[PDB]
UniProtKB/Swiss-Prot annotation:
Induction: Expressed late in the viral replication. Its EC number is 3.2.1.17. It is found in: Host cytoplasm. Belongs to the glycosyl hydrolase 24 family. Substrate binds at residues 32, 104, 117, 132. This is Endolysin. Optimum pH is 7.3. It is an enzyme of class 3 (hydrolase). Changing residue 132 to M/F: 2-fold decrease in enzymatic activity.
């Protein structure tokens, strides 16, 4: 297991434009295209992202390329954020993956907003952090995924993805 397989499990793979859990146009392995309700706007974002006229359909190779870019972006977002970087640096590799997963799903700004959870994680108060993380719109809207990510923070193992 690793962050790529972890996110493939959580996000799946769809080669045509779909809507994510919030109703936003998305493609591939959880690649958000736009928050606009316009499919045409989403298609324009897709073409720009892939570098060709796609008409809403991509190949697996293309989906994987976007995915690699998006994981990279999540990691750099963490490292450039003054709230996220010290927490990330304090964590072991498995729990670092849990933090990347969160940023992949909700963005740097969103995760950086988990101020109290982040503090508990830096203090290595795992059970307390797990309870605090679940007191969130995140957990209430995507509870099974959030439970997997929280279990990863709580235990420092990949047990929730086996």
């Amino acid at each position: 297991m690793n962050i790529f397989e972890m996110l493939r499990i959580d996000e799946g793979l769809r080669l045509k434009i779909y809507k994510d859990t919030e109703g936003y146009y998305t493609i591939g392995i959880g690649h958000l295209l736009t928050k606009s309700p316009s499919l045409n706007a989403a298609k324009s974002e897709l073409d720009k992202a892939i570098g060709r006229n796609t008409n809403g359909v991509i190949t697996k190779d293309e989906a994987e390329k976007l995915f690699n870019q998006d994981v990279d972006a999540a990691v750099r977002g963490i490292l450039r954020n003054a709230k996220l970087k010290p927490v990330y640096d304090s964590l072991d590799a498995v729990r670092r993956a849990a933090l990347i997963n969160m940023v992949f799903q909700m963005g740097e700004t969103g995760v950086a907003g988990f101020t109290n959870s982040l503090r508990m994680l830096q203090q290595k108060r795992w059970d307390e952090a797990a309870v605090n993380l679940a007191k969130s719109r995140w957990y209430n809207q995507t509870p099974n995924r959030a439970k997997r990510v929280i279990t990863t923070f709580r235990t420092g193992t990949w047990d929730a993805y086996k």
